[PDB]
Symmetry: C2
Subunit: 504 residues, 2 copies
């Protein structure tokens, strides 16, 4: 009686969610059903029927037999263990020829890949009274009025399942190695803004419902972060445009005093009077505070605003977080220069980083390729490249790219763990303290950091941007601080470029 | 951090949901913590620590010691058994003074009544990275933008927790007696449309999250039913208004032949030539099919439309289902006359029934009293009695009520099981076949029914309407056919009437 719910597809037309026919177990336990019948049509042996069904459904025999022993009942079912079973489970039970036993056909929502882009695809939930499906999160929810039907509409994503396997596998390794409390990776076409892969940890499996509800927030669109030093690039770009940044000009490294607080470069001691380019390759906070001073505090807030921060990107995900620019005072101002106080979404970081590879134009990231009905062929929606703004010139963008190149490839680089052999890698590293959730200050511990990397390859003329982030490793927190997210960036990026036939 | 989320309140100002401070246990297990410290700041005896913590949190000691045995880790936590701990769990653990052990403050969403109006109130879910709460269902979801904060705004419901207790207890009894696949009960102020209580089974516990997600649909606003014979009252009202219904006029009871289907009164044989009034007391299908003929099939489809059916009531619940009036052919039309084929929501049923007690005016049912901020005192929204339509005259409404009275109290009544001692009750009984989910036709079985009752008391001048519905009893399915929902209507109605100080006899 329910219309088939529309399918969710990846960019190459692979099925990511679809309606299927599963089956539900029913046991007639009343003798009235088998009155005018030679063979019995009700359970005559509750003990043996309980033992045989335990060989297909995951229920102990005592529990089956207990459910079979209910008085004043015509027929009984078996809860969650008795539904959503396959055509093969059906035939295996049927060959047993247990009296009073049958399988009823029921529609379920099938995610063929299981735990796979879970927080993006989402999950639909079934009302057993009617069989109506309703999306509870993600695409299944956002596009529920379209997917629900007579046949509902299909939604096609820009996700490439091949690149998504790379991301899923790389996140799995990060969990085993670092056991972080939060972890995401996203791959974006550097020239169109399409999201080619996205995943996060922890997450759920839409097929089974395992861990669904444990974390509602999609990291790309709904979680917010103090990004850390990946943010320095936008103050870098601004200082370049305003004449403040000179690659070879020297500046005073070490520390600065901001409202009775001592903020210093990551090594406490600094490096003396060193060039700005070397200051950026080193992720120098003193550089960024010096740059802020020279640009002016009023101008720099507008700089972060033109790069999209503090505002939603107007994507297609529900409840997109706006972030906020931390500018209420000079301490917040100066710490915003290196990515604290200010909070961003990852989708905002992608939009703003895209400026450096598109002559200064930010690309609005997008993951919905099509909404269309396959019966009627009506197209409701078509995603497309769209410029979100042009905060910098082509010249400013190219000079930023020169520094990002240096970050990874300078002979004095501290990010050489992000090099991939055979490929020219570039990007920016981040290490950030994390705000404790229940107010106060920052999370405490030996390495209570949100580590990240905003990378792209091949350098200067990238095909993809790969942004990965890991918050609060609970294992190998020393290594987590040392290597950041290189242990995910490298496999994702290497496998993606090779999959995209980028020359090795 | 996160602004305090607004509270959800009942109509008397009792808290139904609110933010609280709970605690999360943390165990530092690394020796670096106790370097420049006289006393240790890490667990020095993991075995004894595992045995002491086992006396407060619900996890085995071997699992504590195992979790404490994680390598390359500074501190470890303990999953679900290790969070949402009370101030007393806090004081109990701290009195132990176990080295390396602390309790971290975490905000939780607290539902003081546990499983209580669950499918209406909903549940908010926590993002553990930030502590941000977001509603996943019901009021928490619908009003999430107001509740989320400064301080978020409070939402005040029309629910009365005193009356909600009666409904919760009465549904619990129906589950034990009948194990039905679906079951709902709702109490509405008969003169204002206010929802005084609402619940369903199965449902979830918002405090614990138990069974949340197993059924997304709120029965009041989002589930749909073939209502059965409760629907006869609206065809009855039409026939009264169109002059077709005469209480003492005789009609031929028994069966009618409709497009190769034989539909008959519930006893198969009917009762011969009996008065129309008595036909309604008996829940005569032939009466209602005869009624449609005298009004006309075109006129009757418009009749159910003016009663609000097929259309959303446009309440404040998300995704309210509209139902549909089953009229594609004469078989669907005739079966619509006694409440099959056509599908409705309970809230449409309430709205249409209220007409009979408000001189013909339908009242739009409502459950949101107020959205307002307690710091600023800004009121964003205020609920109120609102006429949804006036499909019948005052006389038609009064004539309908006389038949509803008779249904329960006629000396020839088949609904005497809904009588309550000391109170005068009226209403209409319902028994309906249920559409099988996997297409085809109806669910099969000995008594595969959705049984219901749409009642009100005191009769003629009711205080509340009580609508309860039970689909597909899996236990005592024979009794479920015999008694319908009398075993919930009576306790709910009786207890509510007493709480509202209606004089008992």
């Amino acid at each position: 009686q329910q219309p088939e719910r529309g399918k969710i597809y990846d960019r190459n037309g692979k099925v990511l969610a679809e309606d299927v026919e599963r089956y539900k177990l029913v046991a007639v336990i009343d003798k009235k059903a088998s009155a005018n019948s030679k063979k019995p049509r009700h359970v005559v042996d509750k003990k043996e029927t309980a033992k045989k069904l335990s060989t297909v459904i995951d229920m102990k025999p005592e529990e089956i037999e207990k459910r079979l022993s209910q008085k004043k009942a015509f027929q009984i079912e078996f809860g969650r263990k008795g539904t959503n079973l396959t055509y093969q489970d059906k035939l295996k039970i049927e060959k047993m020829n247990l009296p009073g036993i049958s399988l009823l056909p029921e529609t379920e929502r099938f995610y063929p890949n299981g735990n796979f882009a879970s927080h993006l695809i989402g999950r639909a939930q079934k009302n057993p009274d009617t069989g109506e499906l309703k999306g509870a999160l993600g695409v299944e929810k956002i596009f529920d009025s379209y997917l629900s039907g007579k046949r509902g509409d299909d939604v096609h994503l820009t996700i490439d399942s091949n690149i998504q396997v790379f991301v899923e596998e790389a996140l799995d390794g990060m969990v085993e190695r670092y056991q972080p409390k939060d972890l995401f990776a996203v791959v974006m076409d550097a020239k169109t803004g399409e999201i080619l892969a996205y995943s996060q940890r922890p997450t759920f499996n839409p097929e089974t419902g395992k861990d669904f509800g444990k974390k509602w927030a999609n990291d790309l669109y709904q979680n917010t972060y103090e990004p850390g030093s990946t943010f320095k690039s936008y103050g870098l770009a601004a200082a370049i445009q305003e004449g403040a940044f000179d690659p070879d000009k020297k500046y005073k490294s070490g520390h600065r005093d901001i409202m009775g607080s001592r903020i210093s470069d990551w090594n406490r001691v600094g490096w003396g009077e060193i060039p700005m380019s070397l200051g950026f390759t080193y992720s120098s906070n003193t550089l960024m505070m010096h740059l802020q001073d020279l640009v002016g505090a009023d101008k720099m807030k507008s700089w972060y605003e033109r790069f999209g921060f503090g505002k939603s990107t107007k994507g297609m995900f529900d409840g997109e977080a706006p972030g906020q620019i931390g500018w209420s005072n000079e301490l917040q101002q100066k710490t915003s220069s290196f990515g604290q106080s200010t909070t961003v979404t990852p989708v905002q970081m992608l939009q703003a980083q895209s400026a450096f590879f598109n002559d200064g134009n930010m690309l609005k990231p997008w993951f919905v390729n099509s909404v269309e009905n396959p019966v009627s062929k009506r197209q409701f929606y078509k995603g497309q490249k769209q410029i979100a703004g042009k905060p910098i010139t082509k010249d400013t963008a190219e000079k930023v790219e020169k520094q990002l190149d240096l970050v990874v490839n300078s002979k004095k680089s501290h990010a050489a763990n992000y090099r991939i052999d055979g490929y020219e890698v570039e990007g920016k590293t981040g290490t950030a303290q994390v705000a404790a959730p229940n107010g106060g200050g920052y999370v405490k511990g030996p390495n209570p950091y949100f580590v990240s990397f905003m990378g792209d390859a091949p350098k200067k003329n990238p095909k993809v941007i790969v942004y990965a982030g890991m918050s609060l490793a609970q294992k190998n927190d020393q290594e987590a601080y040392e290597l950041g997210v290189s242990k995910a960036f490298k496999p994702i990026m290497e496998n993606t470029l090779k999959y995209l036939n980028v020359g090795k």
